[PDB]
Design an enzyme around this catalytic site. Sequence first.
Site, PDB file in Angstrom:
ATOM      1  N   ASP A 188     -24.546 -38.804  48.076  1.00 29.84           N
ATOM      2  CA  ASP A 188     -24.102 -37.323  47.824  1.00 29.84           C
ATOM      3  C   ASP A 188     -24.498 -36.918  46.403  1.00 29.84           C
ATOM      4  O   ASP A 188     -23.041 -36.894  45.491  1.00 29.84           O
ATOM      5  CB  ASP A 188     -23.270 -37.082  49.172  1.00 29.84           C
ATOM      6  N   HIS A 284     -32.605 -32.063  56.114  1.00 24.25           N
ATOM      7  CA  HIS A 284     -31.660 -31.407  55.559  1.00 24.25           C
ATOM      8  C   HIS A 284     -32.130 -31.180  54.771  1.00 24.25           C
ATOM      9  O   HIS A 284     -32.511 -30.457  53.255  1.00 24.25           O
ATOM     10  CB  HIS A 284     -30.181 -32.362  55.364  1.00 24.25           C
TER      11      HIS A 284
HETATM   12  C1  HEM Z   1     -21.191 -31.529  55.269  1.00 24.89           C
HETATM   13  C2  HEM Z   1     -22.407 -30.586  54.524  1.00 24.89           C
HETATM   14  C3  HEM Z   1     -23.418 -31.294  53.852  1.00 24.89           C
HETATM   15  C4  HEM Z   1     -23.733 -32.311  53.865  1.00 24.89           C
HETATM   16  C5  HEM Z   1     -22.960 -33.913  54.475  1.00 24.89           C
HETATM   17  C6  HEM Z   1     -25.131 -32.842  52.399  1.00 24.89           C
HETATM   18  C7  HEM Z   1     -25.015 -33.864  52.568  1.00 24.89           C
HETATM   19  C8  HEM Z   1     -26.859 -33.980  51.963  1.00 24.89           C
HETATM   20  C9  HEM Z   1     -27.221 -35.571  51.021  1.00 24.89           C
HETATM   21  C10 HEM Z   1     -26.596 -36.658  51.487  1.00 24.89           C
HETATM   22  C11 HEM Z   1     -28.244 -35.051  50.185  1.00 24.89           C
HETATM   23  C12 HEM Z   1     -29.453 -36.180  50.321  1.00 24.89           C
HETATM   24  C13 HEM Z   1     -28.735 -37.005  48.355  1.00 24.89           C
HETATM   25  C14 HEM Z   1     -28.414 -35.624  47.133  1.00 24.89           C
HETATM   26  O1  HEM Z   1     -29.521 -35.317  47.003  1.00 24.89           O
HETATM   27  O2  HEM Z   1     -27.746 -35.317  47.155  1.00 24.89           O
HETATM   28  C15 HEM Z   1     -28.289 -33.568  49.906  1.00 24.89           C
HETATM   29  C16 HEM Z   1     -29.413 -32.773  49.951  1.00 24.89           C
HETATM   30  C17 HEM Z   1     -28.789 -31.542  49.431  1.00 24.89           C
HETATM   31  N1  HEM Z   1     -28.042 -30.745  49.939  1.00 24.89           N
HETATM   32 FE1  HEM Z   1     -26.459 -31.072  50.942  1.00 24.89          FE
HETATM   33  N2  HEM Z   1     -25.225 -31.180  52.622  1.00 24.89           N
HETATM   34  C18 HEM Z   1     -24.406 -31.062  52.956  1.00 24.89           C
HETATM   35  C19 HEM Z   1     -24.218 -29.294  53.381  1.00 24.89           C
HETATM   36  C20 HEM Z   1     -25.280 -28.755  52.410  1.00 24.89           C
HETATM   37  C21 HEM Z   1     -25.321 -27.036  52.093  1.00 24.89           C
HETATM   38  C22 HEM Z   1     -24.179 -26.333  53.450  1.00 24.89           C
HETATM   39  C23 HEM Z   1     -26.182 -27.049  50.930  1.00 24.89           C
HETATM   40  C24 HEM Z   1     -26.604 -25.354  50.415  1.00 24.89           C
HETATM   41  C25 HEM Z   1     -26.499 -24.722  50.928  1.00 24.89           C
HETATM   42  C26 HEM Z   1     -26.969 -28.085  50.292  1.00 24.89           C
HETATM   43  C27 HEM Z   1     -28.041 -28.173  49.805  1.00 24.89           C
HETATM   44  C28 HEM Z   1     -28.297 -29.489  49.285  1.00 24.89           C
HETATM   45  C29 HEM Z   1     -29.440 -29.705  48.038  1.00 24.89           C
HETATM   46  C30 HEM Z   1     -29.810 -28.020  47.061  1.00 24.89           C
HETATM   47  C31 HEM Z   1     -29.888 -30.840  48.147  1.00 24.89           C
HETATM   48  C32 HEM Z   1     -30.820 -31.042  47.646  1.00 24.89           C
HETATM   49  C33 HEM Z   1     -32.576 -30.804  48.126  1.00 24.89           C
HETATM   50  C34 HEM Z   1     -33.561 -31.496  47.314  1.00 24.89           C
HETATM   51  O3  HEM Z   1     -33.847 -31.184  46.387  1.00 24.89           O
HETATM   52  O4  HEM Z   1     -33.304 -33.140  47.871  1.00 24.89           O
HETATM   53  N3  HEM Z   1     -25.950 -29.196  51.834  1.00 24.89           N
HETATM   54  N4  HEM Z   1     -27.404 -33.118  50.478  1.00 24.89           N
END
Ligand code: HEM
Lengths: 376, 375
Positions: A188, A284
Site C-alpha cells: 500500500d 480499485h
Molecule cells: C481501506 C481502504 C483502502 C485500501 C485497502 C486501499 C488499498 C490500495 C492499494 C492496495 C492500492 C495499490 C497500491 C498503491 O499504489 O498504493 C491503492 C492504490 C490507490 N488508492 Fe487506495 N485504498 C483504500 C482507500 C482509498 C481511498 C479512500 C482513496 C482516495 C479517495 C484511495 C486512493 C488511491 C489512489 C490514488 C491509488 C493509486 C492509483 C494509481 O495511481 O495507481 N484509496 N489503494
Amino acid sequence: PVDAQRLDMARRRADANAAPQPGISGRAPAFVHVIAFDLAEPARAEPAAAREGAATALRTWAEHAARLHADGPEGAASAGLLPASLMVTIGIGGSLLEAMDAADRRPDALADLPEFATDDLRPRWCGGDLMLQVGAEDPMVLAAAVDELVAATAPTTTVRWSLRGFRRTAAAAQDPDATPRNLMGQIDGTANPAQDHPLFTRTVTAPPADDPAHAWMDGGSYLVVRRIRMLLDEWRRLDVPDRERVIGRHLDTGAPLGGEKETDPVVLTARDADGRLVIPEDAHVRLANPENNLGARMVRRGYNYDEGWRDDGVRDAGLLFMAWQGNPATGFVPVQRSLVEQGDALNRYTRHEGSALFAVPAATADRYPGQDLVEG
Amino acid sequence: PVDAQRLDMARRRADANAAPQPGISGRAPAFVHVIAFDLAEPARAEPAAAREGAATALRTWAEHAARLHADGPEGAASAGLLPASLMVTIGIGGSLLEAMDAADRRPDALADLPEFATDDLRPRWCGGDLMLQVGAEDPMVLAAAVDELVAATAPTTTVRWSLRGFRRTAAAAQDPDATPRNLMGQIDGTANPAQDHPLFTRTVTAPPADDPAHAWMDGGSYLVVRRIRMLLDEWRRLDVPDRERVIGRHLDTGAPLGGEKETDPVVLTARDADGRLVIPEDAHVRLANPENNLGARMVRRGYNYDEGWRDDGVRDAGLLFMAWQGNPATGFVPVQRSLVEQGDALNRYTRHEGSALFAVPAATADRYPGQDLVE
Ligand code: HEM
Ligand code: HEM
C-alpha cells in the site's frame, strides 16, 4: 549493512526542517497518533476569545514540538530511549476559522468535504478545530510525546477524537526500504510520487493564493483523514485471485495484473485473448488512477489500526487513511467521487466511519504554524 | 556491539519449548495482544457440544501455534517480515469447565477471584472461557498472527474482550537489557524473581495435584489479568519526590528510597533523623513485599496500553497487569488484599476496570494444552 538500515529509524532524529512541516515527506515512522481537538467553551463561543485560544494552543504546541524534535520527551516514561524519528505536525480545521469569525481567511481548498453515498460516519469521530499528528518509531517515545502535548494546552483545548496506528517496524523488516502492507495483506503506497521528484512537491504543496487573505496557506498542505474499517470476515471468504481482482494488483509481488514487478506501470488497456479487461472495470486502481480523475494525485501516508472487537464481536480494525495534497478538490475529492460513483469493488469490503480535513501551514523561521492566520 | 543487541528481539524466533508454555519466562517481546473468548452459543449451551467445541478450539490454536512458532504467519500481511520473537500462549477459564459439565475438574487454584473493595470492574471486560496471549517484537507480525488465530476457531469461538499493549522496543532502547518502564514513568519488574533461578520456577509452577481429577494442571501456571487504568492527569500534579513516595523507589534510578542502585535491597526498617520512615508506611512496594504477605509472590509480566480518550473525556490508558503464579491463593490474591485493606498510596491513582483468571497448562510432546482435561 542492512543491519544499520534496520536500526536507522529508531536511532535517528527526524528532520525538523521538513516542509511544510514534519510528518509529510521523508521516511515515515512505524507508529502514529492522530489527535483532533476542539477549543473549549466559553472561549470558543466568542470570536476574540477563540482567536486568543487558537494563538495559545498553536504557539504552545510549536514550542513543545521544537523541544521534542531536539531533545525528545521530558518524562521519566521515555528515559533511556533513542530519538526514534519523533515528529510533530500541527493542523487547523475550517471550524476554527468559523469560531474566530474569520470566514474571509478561509481558502476554497479548506471547504468542507462532500458527503458520499457510502459514508457511515460517526459525528464525534469527524472534524475538529485543531489537529496534532505525532509519529515515532517507538510506541513508548510516542505515548510520552502525546501526553506531553495534550496536557500542555489543557484546558484551552479538549480532545475530540483520536486514533493510533502502526506499520511494520524497520527493525523487523527484511528490507526496510520495501513499501509497507495493510491488514488486507496488500502492498500500500506504490503509486505515490517518489520522495526525490519535484512531482512529490507539486502534489502536496498549496500553490500561492490569489487572495492575500488566503495566503497563510501558501506552501502548506491539506490532510484528509479517513478512518476506514475493513470487513475482514467478508474479505477472508474470497480466494486470493478474487482479492487481487478487487484491487487490480497481485498480492505477493504487488505487480499490476498483467505485469511482473511492483513498479511496472498499471496498464489499463490490457485485454485477454477473448476481449476481457485484465484489470476489471471495477478494480480499485483502475478507478483511482489519475487518468480517470482529471489528473488528480495525492500522497497517501496511512497506517493500520487495530481496535479489537466491538460488542457484536465484529472486528474493529482497518486503515487510518491519510491523504496529503495541495488542494483536496484536485486530490482526494474527485478520486473518492470516482470510487463511490463508479462502484469500486473495494466499497463492499470497507466502511468509512471517521473523516476530517485539516490545513497544515508552513511556518517561517521564528513563527508558529498558523501565526499568519491568528495574527492577521 | 549493542547494535546486535538492539536488533536481536526482532531477528530471532521465540523458544517454542519454553515451559509450561511460551509467554511466561524468557525475554518478553515489545507487543502483546490478550484475547478472551467464549464458546459460541451453538457450542456452549450443551455439555457434549461444549466439550467438542473446546477440543476443536484448543487443538486448532495449538496446531497454528506450532506453525506460527516455526515459520511465522501465513497471510500476505506479514510478508517480508522477520520472526520478531512471535509467541502464543493458550489458556482456559473456569467457566469452560462449567459449560462442559466438568466443574469437578476445577483445581482449587482455579477458584474465582474475590471481589475487592477498590474494584471498578466492567463485566464486559472480565472473564472468558478461553484465552490467547499473542506476543511479538513487531506490531504487524503480531496483528497477522492474531487475525490467523481468531479466524481459525470461528465460529466455535467468539471474542469476549481483548486488549493490546506495548513496551519500548529493543531497537529504540539505549540498553536493551534495562528493565522497561510504565506510563507513570516507573521502572516496572525489578523485584520479579530472576529467571535463571529456582525461585522463579517455584513461583510460577502449579505443584502436582493430590487427585487425578485436577492433574491436568500439573506443571502449568495461572494468569491473573487486570486492566488497570492510570489516573495520569492526577499523577501529573505530583512533584517527583511525592511520586517516588507513592511507590517507595526513585524514578531516575529505580533504587529503593534510601538506596543507590535499582538492585539494592529494600530496607523497610530505615528512618530519618526526624523519626520518619524512609519508605512510607503506605508505599506500594512496602505493602506488596512478600514478607508483608506470608511469603506470597508472583511474576509480573505486564504491558502499557493506550486507548485514547473516552467519550466522557477521561484518558483511557494504563497498565495491562499480568501476574503469573502456581496458585493465585499464594500469589496475586493475598497481595491484592493487602494493597486494598492497608490503603496502598497507589490506589487513588489507579482503577481496576477488567479482570480474568486463566489456567495455562503445561505443553507436552504431541498433545495440545488442555487435552488431558477435554479428552
Ligand atoms: C481501506 C481502504 C483502502 C485500501 C485497502 C486501499 C488499498 C490500495 C492499494 C492496495 C492500492 C495499490 C497500491 C498503491 O499504489 O498504493 C491503492 C492504490 C490507490 N488508492 Fe487506495 N485504498 C483504500 C482507500 C482509498 C481511498 C479512500 C482513496 C482516495 C479517495 C484511495 C486512493 C488511491 C489512489 C490514488 C491509488 C493509486 C492509483 C494509481 O495511481 O495507481 N484509496 N489503494
Ligand atoms: C497500575 C498499577 C500498578 C503499578 C503502576 C505498579 C507499579 C509497581 C512498581 C513501580 C513497582 C516497583 C518495581 C518492581 O519491583 O517491579 C512494583 C512492585 C510490585 N508490585 Fe506493583 N504496580 C501496580 C499494580 C500491582 C498489583 C495489582 C499487584 C498485586 C496484586 C502488584 C504487585 C507488586 C509486587 C508483588 C511488587 C514487588 C514488591 C517487592 O517485592 O519489592 N502491583 N509495582
